[PDB]
């Protein structure tokens, strides 16, 4: 059972990193980012599966999640579908302080909170998630 899930999640991690690199190059080559949109359905289906959350946290897929959420050097934000799906997945999983330390997603969350091109609903969700993640540190 679960060794296999870790291998599949690692393969998904490699695919996500490769798709992000390809989309960044395509934007640098004057082409729209399409690979992330192509991979979005499979990532959504994997993330929606609750029992795989433990394996996701054991493979630290949140690093690739943050890589996708990281704005590209052209100062262009990711597609709204990607942001919405990743926010929903982040809400749907029990993120603890150790996972945040491994991934460092707090920096991107703070950037999303401070930014204004971000959707106001995403702004409120980012504030809520940041407060929830600061909750265990102070008590």
């Amino acid at each position: 059972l679960e060794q296999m899930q870790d291998e599949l999640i690692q393969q998904l991690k490699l695919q996500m990193e490769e798709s992000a690199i390809r989309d960044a190059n395509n934007i640098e080559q004057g082409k729209p980012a399409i690979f992330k949109l192509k991979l979005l359905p499979k990532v959504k289906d994997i993330l929606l599966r609750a029992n795989l959350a433990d394996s996701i946290l054991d493979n630290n897929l949140l690093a690739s999640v943050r890589l996708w959420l990281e704005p590209l050097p052209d100062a262009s934000l990711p597609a709204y579908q990607i942001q919405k799906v990743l926010f929903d997945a982040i809400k749907s999983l029990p993120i603890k302080t150790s996972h945040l330390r491994e991934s460092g997603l707090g920096k991107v969350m703070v950037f999303y909170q401070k930014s204004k091109r971000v959707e106001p609903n995403l702004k409120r969700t980012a504030e809520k998630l940041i407060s929830d993640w600061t909750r265990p540190i102070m008590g």
Binding site: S131, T134, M138, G139
Partner: peptide
């Protein structure tokens, strides 16, 4: 500061 003053569990209800 302003951020540090956010409430905790032991703060008054």
């Amino acid at each position: 500061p302003q951020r540090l003053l956010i409430p905790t569990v032991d703060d008054p209800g």
